[PDB]
Swiss-Prot record:
Disruption phenotype: Deficient mice display partial neonatal and postnatal lethality, hemorrhages, impaired association of vascular smooth muscle cells with capillaries and small arteries and veins, and impaired contact between mesangial cells and renal glomerular capillaries. The inflammatory response is reduced in an inflammatory hindlimb ischemia-reperfusion model. Deficient mice display reduced central respiratory chemoreflex, increased apnea frequency, and blunted ventilatory responses to CO2. Decreased net acid secretion by the kidney, resulting in a nongap metabolic acidosis.
Gene Ontology biological process terms in this record: adenylate cyclase-activating G protein-coupled receptor signaling pathway; angiogenesis involved in wound healing; cellular response to acidic pH; G protein-coupled receptor signaling pathway; glomerular mesangial cell development; negative regulation of angiogenesis; phospholipase C-activating G protein-coupled receptor signaling pathway; positive regulation of inflammatory response
Chief place where the protein resides: membrane
Superkingdom of source: Eukaryota
Protein's name according to its UniProt entry: G-protein coupled receptor 4
Topology, Cytoplasmic side: 36-39, 112-119, 201-204
Residues of the full protein shown: 13 to 305 of 365
Family, similarity comment: Belongs to the G-protein coupled receptor 1 family.
Length: 293
């Protein structure tokens, strides 16, 4: 039931994420909008992704103090329900737009000459709206229940309880299995298909093929290295609470790792612009033509 001193790692990783994402996710948003202007349906997804990790980034300050102040912030018994829900519900939105891009890259490279209706800007808007709606609806149970819970150990939390409630375990399991592995499996399969289709192009020079390979592998590996520790610890917590709830002895030995990994989950906000709208020579031109405007 106790805790530790997490005022060093996620007092600083969040600051770095803010300071590197605010001036880069905005430029990724600009590049995505430029893509949308010239009838490129990928940009829509890209654009949404930027939104998905801008309104997330602006949520961090309310939390950095939560981790600078030793594990408590009294800023609103009704405020850790619409700013803090966002904190826990963009990791599962961004990843979805990570998947939507991958399929859109599978359907255009692996299956050209087909599926022209699915690569319109209109259908991109429809899919993006459905993604937003379903992600904001499935993760909507924390809005209902009371969240700001105070212990006697001098710290009160925002959206986490120690030991956690029964309903939290089932949503944690759902998050792990239907917000991380399913979109990640789709990304892996789609980039596998793209590599398998591009290994037959007559018009690629045995070098761009290697560049595509080491870009797709990185795209499917950064998501893993950023989200895996958190969901591994989340599944571990939700499997120990559902075998022995009263004997909350596992929690004390894993609280620090849990919070450090939750902080580490925030590196996708700086990985996404770099890997998606700033690494290639095309969007980088539309960015360098905007830093001078």
């Amino acid at each position: 039931v106790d805790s530790r001193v997490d005022h060093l790692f996620p007092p600083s990783l969040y600051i770095f994420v803010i300071g590197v994402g605010l001036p880069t996710n905005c430029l990724a948003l600009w590049a995505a909008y430029r893509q949308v202007r010239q009838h490129n349906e990928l940009g829509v997804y890209l654009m949404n992704l930027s939104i998905a990790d801008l309104l997330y980034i602006c949520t961090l300050p309310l939390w950095v103090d939560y981790f600078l102040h030793h594990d408590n912030w009294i800023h609103g018994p009704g405020s850790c329900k619409l700013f803090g829900f966002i904190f826990y519900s963009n990791i599962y939105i961004s990843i979805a737009f990570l998947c939507c891009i991958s399929v859109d890259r599978y359907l255009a490279v692996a299956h050209p000459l087909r599926f022209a209706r699915l690569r319109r800007v209109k259908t991109a808007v429809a899919v993006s709206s459905v993604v937003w709606a379903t992600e904001l609806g499935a993760n909507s149970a924390p809005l209902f229940h009371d969240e700001l819970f105070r212990d006697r150990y001098n710290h009160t939390f925002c959206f986490e309880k120690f030991p956690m409630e029964r309903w939290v375990a089932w949503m944690n399991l759902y998050r792990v299995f239907v917000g991380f592995l399913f979109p990640w499996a789709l990304m892996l399969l789609c980039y596998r298909g793209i590599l398998r289709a591009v290994q037959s192009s007559v018009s690629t020079e045995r070098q761009e093929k290697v560049k595509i390979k080491r870009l797709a592998l990185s795209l499917i590996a950064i998501v893993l290295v950023c989200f895996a520790p958190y969901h591994a610890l989340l599944l571990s917590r939700s499997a120990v609470y559902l075998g022995r709830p009263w004997d909350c002895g596992f929690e004390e030995r894993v609280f620090s790792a849990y919070h450090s990994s939750l902080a580490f989950t925030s590196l996708n906000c700086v990985a996404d612009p770099i890997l998606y709208c700033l690494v290639n020579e095309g969007a980088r031109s539309d960015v360098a033509k905007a830093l001078h405007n």
